[PDB]
Design a protein around this ligand. Structure first.
Ligand code: ZN
Ligand code: ZN
Lengths: 1284, 142, 52, 61, 42
């Protein structure tokens, strides 16, 4: 607990019963109303009897204080949630937010000190790339005055207020929960200017002076408000400073102001109208279709739903509906295509709705109990198509044969001849004679994989309590009776790691033998899900240990075995799209429908009566929705078999459960799609992405036909196919609702945005709403926060935002983050030794916030990252950035000498080989990472599980260090090769499993209580943060000089001189080899060329360059026209040979190569030598871009080979073309057409001063005695030693 | 001769296999009679007038057989009521709004949009509404 | 002399006997086929509660 | 003459009889196929014929 | 001829007995089918 801070971001749902219980025990009169008064009844009974404890006493004290304070406002009135959103989103106070206002003012002044030189430095990059010797005036003004806009936005005061409240509540929680201290100081109000505020451990009270309203909030509500307000602030600031969203700004402002006004009157049902904002965007996008009969199909349903939800609550008058429709029209109707996928990102800026358990229980009980009627011919036709698919799948991979395959009885002569001759068959034959497959029988032809991996078992989940203790999760305070104790553990990972007798083909027998239908400990229970925008929404279920293991095993079996067979006058093809959702199918499935396929799978795999366990178990159990604050209406503990089919229980369900058996369901659905395709006479292509499903329908037509007629014919045939498919699915008994799917001829929605007719629309403003002032870690880490900020900014850049504005925003956010972490924190180790000198010295802070991270600073965004996706070498790129800053006069000139004569750290060959590119910095790691590694290795060492035996010993670290030393300590150091070898060796697998094991606060606290972390380590990790600021201070204040350094030397030479000094204790003057490649933005010049000029200014002799060309007209919006013996190789011999390849094939090093390979495989020297390939030594693709589809890249003038051999891209060649395309994009960003003339782009390159006269040495003879483990490991999961 | 007499009498007395196979075929007939009787008894008129039905157990069909006029099946969608296939107006208040939205999102002239809205505010009736929609389609997509 | 009675009689009877059994089989098999066609169009009803 | 063509007409039966028998065989087999496919997934209706008929595996233990 | 008029005379019975022995199994098979199915209506 001493090293675990409370949460900083909402990760839980909002339950009404929590607030209701807190207020009921504090005895404060409220105005909530529940659907089931069981909680109030239980609490009243308990209070009448005389229960009491520490929480009750504390809440009684707080309630007495509140009651005493409320006597000065004789006209108060509680306002529930979310009826208080319009007020709490605009609250403000002047006195209580005094501390942070001065910090942010200081940050704004610090930024304004250097914003000018920041712009001056950003302009030279444009001047070099060739986009003109000057930026745009508005852009210059925004970059200079970025602070004033952010400070003048309309969310500043609410943001300040909510940040203050959140951090104060977190400090209270942390300082109190550590029960070593006992004395409790009762809380007291704090009279502000406009409001009055009271903060306690688990209850916040706010009183408004003027209107005399009263609000009571909890921790989750506080976190939610803070997140929402900060997101709104960042998004509005971005849209204001940019000049492309000038019309989107007004629309989204009006949307906020309109919808916010509905809360005080409507109430909680407003979130239904909020959730309706996502499909309305697609409905309004449909209006731009080309087949006029389609315009309005989905809109006619959305409007009906909105009218009905507005009518069912008392607003029956038509004026309200009419005005709301007018407002929605004004909001959504637009003209540009790219600016309609943005509203897709704002539907989470209103919060989340409060929910109960009774409503969800009823919503799922409505579906779990419903009779159906199904026809038989359609089922059999689907089954026939299924068998045909499987037949063809196995005919492939073997070649025209059915050796272990089916055994027909009275089939048609065509089918019999097909089997006899060994040729495939089409859907037509199967669907025409399905009667021939009524009685077929397969034979076992698939093996079982029982030592594949461990991810499935190692992923963390939860387990429900045993059946005879089902009510052990409800605390004693909310129940009318005292429950029985809870015994079993509640973590799959620790139950697994402590299971002393585990066997994969033993759970399989536990299912096959029919013992799971009599286990008196089976139990299943539902629990609520957070961060949804629907009351009913979703849930997720928990089961018991054995059944969870069996489910995982079965689904992995399917996904690894058969599931691969389902891979997914000039005429031409046209296509249309159908988009639907796939939820509630798990509720609509049934035994009578799934058994016909489960039986084929049983006969194929061998396991008798296996793949239909879910229904056979659920048809006799009793489910319930569990939540600690929603107790059941009972009087004494009764078995789960005597509750009524009622409030929170679901007795004897019929359907399935989301998540489980999903592979079986998705491979059993497809045949009906193909059946409808055959019945209609078209060709289809399917795709499934989570819950969405897309079906593309294709049809052949002549070429010279007009575009309109083409699309119209495609749409007609697609509508026909849709009608037929709906009619078919209704027979087996699913539900394709006639007004819940989108039929279109232009677009379909998949994971990353909306694909619109050969082009993807942007979603730029999504990550800006996430870049915030902390990050999810068990402690508070400034470096983690800054790295997350840089990551979100780069991800937003690559979706359409502006590079320079994003860079400046990143700089400002980094400065503010450093200031907040130094001056406004809940940490207790920040003392006067660092906080006073740093907060006093101004320029030192600016330099620390501007210096790049890989060489000491805290800025995690290099300039080349704005253009390319991956830079070559972080060290040389950061040195180039520092040189650019020094040139542009942003930082003093001695910073180079300081950073090049800083003091080295202390790491070992293992750390170097595990992070090859790193310099030897001081205390730059991550606390959460360093803690997770230790706790995972410790908990793995003590594990009697027979599946991982001999894989973890107390000497593993020693052997790893010795192996790394033997690999690296030669007369020439090759960190990349060492890293590859060590990654592929056994240590790689060890650490990979350790990292795959995902541990969190629960397991960490459990292991600490066990005693896995010593006091020395916990104190070091508690002090780790302040040491970083100390190191930064001493680095930036040091003063030495390196007389062999002038700031015009090459970045490569500078990086060499830095590495050969920071690694001086281990290298001992030996040359480090093959690490750095030249920087992008320092070795490339650009030049545009137009009507009649030539590349004069860059044609002084440089005659090698890339060539780009792009003519067009009105466009950019819409277009109108080696043995390798095919075996189980992927087990470990892949690794065993890749290691040997990376090692080499020299004179006698083959002995050691074979040694380290035979370590992880069972091969001989000659077999390895004949199975490994030989090489030369020991060792385009685009992004979201509009204009990329119009250019004609050429590189004939630049293919010049330096180092004089046809090699891999000497310089990473794709980077040149990527930079060129980026330049063209940022040139044609904010206009409509390419213009009149033709623009051609020269991209010249001269990487001559950045060359290394490296010598390709034959091989580096080792100087050490190889010594590995005495005996090898024969564990089949790890790379075995007897596979072959 | 003697061979004639013997090889005539043999078969002409062992003829009895004909009455034996007639026994066989009458047994087959009486066994299929009850089969088709059971299959007739399993069902009577039903939405066709004959579609046999069976259930998981014997008596678990009394919840979907009467509501013998079983239940409501899938509702057929044509070219008269709106669905995801195409849009047709009707008397409800949503059709006027979606027509207004089509007019607004069209590519016509502003005064033309005003003219169409003025015609629409007094157009009344299902048939006249459908006629106005059919004319508007041509006007906007021409 | 002796062949007339037996030959003529028990060759005339087999005529109608075999023709009648042939037509009987030929009608029984189509009765089978209609029964099969009937059974090939059937409907399954699913209850609501898995246990009752 | 008379006896020859009488034996002819008494032989002209067996072929039709056999082909009718084969057609009946195919029909009955289709019937049993339907019955098996229903009894697989109605479910139930049996002593122990439901679906253990698959050969166990190459890993019986 | 008139005495060697017996080859088909015996072959007819030789195949008719096979006819009998298969129609019997057909009878028993349809019998077991109706037995299986009669217990499925109510
Ligand atoms: Zn040039
Ligand atoms: Zn250079």
């Amino acid at each position: 607990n001493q090293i675990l801070y409370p949460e900083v971001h909402l990760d839980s749902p909002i339950v009404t019963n929590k607030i209701v219980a807190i207020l009921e025990y504090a005895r404060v009169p409220h105005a909530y109303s529940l659907e089931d008064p069981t909680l109030c009844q239980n609490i009243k009974h308990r209070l009448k009897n005389g229960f009491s404890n520490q929480m009750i006493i504390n809440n009684v004290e707080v309630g007495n204080v509140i009651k005493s304070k409320l006597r000065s406002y004789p006209a108060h009135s509680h306002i529930p949630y979310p009826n208080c959103n319009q007020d709490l989103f605009n609250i403000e106070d002047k006195e209580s937010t005094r501390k942070i206002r001065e910090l942010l003012k200081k940050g704004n002044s610090l930024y304004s000190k250097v914003s000018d030189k920041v712009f001056q430095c950003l302009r030279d990059t444009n001047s070099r790339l060739g986009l003109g010797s000057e930026l745009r005036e508005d852009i210059k003004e925004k970059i200079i005055n970025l602070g004033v806009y952010m400070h003048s936005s309309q969310w500043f005061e609410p943001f300040l207020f909510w940040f203050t409240v959140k951090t104060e509540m977190r400090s209270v929680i942390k300082s109190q929960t550590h029960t070593c201290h006992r004395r409790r100081h009762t809380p007291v109000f704090f009279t502000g200017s406009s409001v009055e505020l009271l903060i306690s451990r688990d209850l916040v009270a706010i009183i408004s002076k003027e209107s005399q309203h009263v609000y009571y909030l909890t921790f989750e509500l506080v976190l939610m408000y803070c997140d929402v307000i900060e997101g709104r602030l960042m998004t509005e600031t971005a849209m204001t400073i940019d000049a492309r969203y000038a019309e989107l700004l007004g629309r989204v402002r009006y949307m906020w102001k309109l919808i916010d006004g509905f809360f005080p009157a409507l109430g909680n049902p407003t979130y239904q109208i909020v959730a309706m904002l996502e499909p309305l965007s697609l409905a309004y996008l449909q209006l731009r279709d080309i087949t006029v009969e389609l315009r309005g199909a989905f809109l006619n349903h959305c409007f009906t739903e909105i009218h009905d939800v507005l009518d069912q609550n008392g607003f029956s008058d038509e004026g309200t509906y009419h005005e709301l429709i007018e407002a929605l029209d004004y909001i959504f109707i637009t003209d540009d295509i790219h600016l309609t996928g943005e509203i897709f990102s704002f539907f989470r800026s209103f919060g989340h709705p409060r929910l109960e358990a009774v409503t969800a229980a009823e919503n799922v009980r409505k579906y779990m109990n419903q009779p159906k009627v199904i026809v038989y011919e359609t089922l059999m036709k689907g089954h026939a198509i299924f068998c045909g698919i499987i037949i063809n799948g196995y005919r492939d991979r073997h070649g025209g044969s059915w050796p272990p395959l089916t055994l027909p009885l009275h089939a048609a002569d065509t089918i019999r001849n097909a089997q006899a001759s060994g040729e495939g068959l089409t859907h037509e034959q199967c669907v025409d004679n399905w009667k021939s497959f009524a009685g077929v029988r397969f034979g076992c032809f698939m093996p079982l994989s029982l030592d594949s991996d461990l991810t499935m078992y190692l992923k963390d989940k939860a387990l429900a309590a045993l059946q005879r203790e089902w009510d052990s999760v409800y605390p004693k305070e909310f129940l009318r009776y005292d429950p029985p104790k809870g015994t079993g553990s509640r973590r799959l990972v620790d139950v697994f790691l402590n299971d002393s007798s585990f066997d994969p083909y033993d759970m399989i027998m536990y299912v096959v033998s029919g013992a799971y239908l009599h286990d008196p400990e089976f139990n299943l229970s539902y629990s609520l899900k957070e961060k949804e925008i629907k009351e009913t929404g979703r849930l997720f279920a928990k089961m018991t240990y054995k059944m969870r293991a069996c489910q995982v095993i079965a689904e992995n079996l399917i996904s690894n075995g058969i599931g691969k067979y389902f891979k997914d006058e000039t005429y031409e093809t046209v296509s249309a799209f159908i988009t639907t959702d796939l939820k509630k199918y798990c509720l609509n499935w049934r035994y009578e429908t799934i058994s016909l396929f489960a039986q084929r799978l049983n006969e194929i795999y061998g396991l008798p009566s296996f793949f239909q366990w879910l229904h056979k178990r659920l048809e006799t159990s009793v489910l319930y929705v569990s939540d600690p604050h929603c107790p059941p209406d009972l009087d004494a503990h009764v078995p789960l078999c005597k509750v009524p089919n009622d409030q929170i229980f679901i007795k004897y369900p019929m359907g399935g459960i989301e998540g489980y058996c999903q592979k079986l369901w998705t491979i059993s659905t497809i045949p009906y799609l193909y059946l409808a395709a055959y019945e209609s006479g078209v060709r289809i292509a399917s795709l499934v992405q989570g819950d969405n499903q897309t079906i593309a329908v294709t049809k052949r037509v002549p070429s010279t036909w007009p575009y309109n007629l083409k699309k119209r014919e495609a749409a007609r045939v697609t509508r026909d196919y849709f009608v037929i498919l709906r009619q078919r699915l209704h027979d087996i008994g699913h539900h394709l609702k006639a007004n819940e799917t989108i039929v279109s001829s232009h677009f379909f929605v998949y994971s990353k945005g909306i694909y619109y007719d050969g082009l993807l629309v942007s979603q730029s403003l999504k990550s800006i709403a996430r870049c915030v002032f902390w990050s999810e870690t068990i402690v508070d880490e400034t470096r983690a926060a800054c790295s997350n900020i840089a990551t979100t900014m780069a991800k937003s850049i690559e979706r359409g935002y502006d590079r320079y504005l994003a860079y400046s925003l990143n700089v400002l956010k980094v400065i503010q983050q450093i200031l907040i972490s130094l001056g406004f924190t809940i940490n207790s180790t920040m003392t006067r030794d660092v906080v006073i000198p740093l907060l006093t010295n101004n320029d030192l802070l600016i330099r620390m916030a501007l210096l790049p991270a890989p060489i000491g600073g805290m800025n995690y965004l290099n300039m080349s990252r704005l253009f390319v996706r991956n830079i070559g070498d972080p060290v040389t790129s950061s040195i180039a950035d520092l040189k650019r800053m020094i040139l542009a006069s942003l930082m003093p000139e001695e910073t180079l000498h300081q950073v090049m004569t800083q003091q080295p750290g202390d790491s070992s060959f293992l750390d170097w080989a595990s992070d090859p590119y790193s310099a030897n910095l001081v205390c730059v790691q991550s606390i959460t990472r360093l803690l997770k590694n230790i706790t995972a290795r410790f908990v793995l060492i003590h594990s009697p599980n027979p599946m991982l035996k001999g894989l973890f010993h107390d000497d593993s670290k020693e052997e790893d260090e010795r192996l790394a030393a033997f690999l690296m300590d030669r007369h020439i150091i090759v960190p990349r090769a060492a890293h590859e070898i060590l990654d592929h060796s056994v240590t790689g697998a060890r650490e990979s499993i350790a990292g795959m094991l995902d541990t969190t606060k629960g397991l960490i606290r459990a292991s600490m209580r066990k005693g896995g972390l010593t006091s020395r380590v916990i104190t070091r990790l508690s002090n780790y943060d302040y040491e970083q600021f100390r190191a930064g201070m001493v680095l930036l204040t040091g003063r030495k000089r390196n007389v062999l350094i002038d700031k015009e030397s090459c970045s490569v030479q500078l990086a060499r001189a830095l590495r050969s000094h920071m690694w001086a204790r281990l290298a001992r003057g030996r040359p480090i080899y093959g690490l750095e490649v030249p920087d992008v933005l320092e070795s490339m010049r650009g030049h545009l060329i137009r009507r009649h000029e030539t590349c004069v200014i860059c044609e002084c002799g440089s005659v090698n360059y890339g060539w780009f060309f792009v003519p067009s007209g009105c466009q950019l919006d819409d277009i109108d026209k080696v043995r390798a013996p095919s075996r189980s190789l992927r087990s470990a011999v892949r690794i065993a040979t890749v290691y040997s390849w990376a090692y080499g094939d020299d004179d006698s090093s083959w002995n050691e190569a074979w040694l380290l390979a035979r370590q992880r495989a069972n091969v001989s020297l000659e077999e390895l030598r004949v199975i490994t390939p030989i090489s030369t030594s020991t060792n385009s693709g685009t992004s979201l871009v509009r204009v990329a589809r119009y250019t004609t890249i050429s590189n004939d003038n630049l293919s010049f080979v330096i180092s004089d051999k046809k090699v891999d891209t000497n310089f990473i060649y794709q980077q040149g073309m990527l930079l060129g395309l980026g330049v063209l994009e940022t040139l044609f960003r904010l206009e409509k057409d390419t213009g009149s003339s033709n623009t051609v782009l020269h991209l010249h390159v001269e990487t001559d001063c950045c060359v290394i006269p490296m010598i390709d040495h034959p091989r580096i003879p080792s100087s050490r005695k190889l010594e590995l483990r005495a005996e090898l490991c024969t564990n089949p999961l790890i790379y075995d030693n007897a596979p072959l | 001769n003697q061979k004639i007499i013997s090889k005539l009498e043999s078969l002409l007395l062992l003829k009895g296999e004909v009455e034996s196979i007639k026994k066989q075929i009458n047994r087959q007939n009486i066994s299929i009679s009850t089969l088709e009787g059971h299959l007739s008894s399993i069902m009577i008129a039903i939405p066709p007038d004959l579609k046999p039905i069976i259930g998981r157990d014997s008596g678990r069909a009394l919840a979907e057989v009467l509501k013998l006029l079983k239940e409501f099946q899938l509702k057929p969608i044509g070219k008269k009521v709106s669905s995801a296939v195409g849009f047709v107006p009707d008397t409800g208040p949503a059709s006027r709004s979606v027509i207004r939205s089509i007019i607004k999102s069209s590519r016509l002239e502003e005064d033309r949009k005003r003219y169409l809205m003025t015609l629409l505010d007094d157009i009344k009736g299902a048939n006249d509404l459908a006629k106005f929609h059919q004319m508007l389609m041509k006007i906007i997509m021409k």
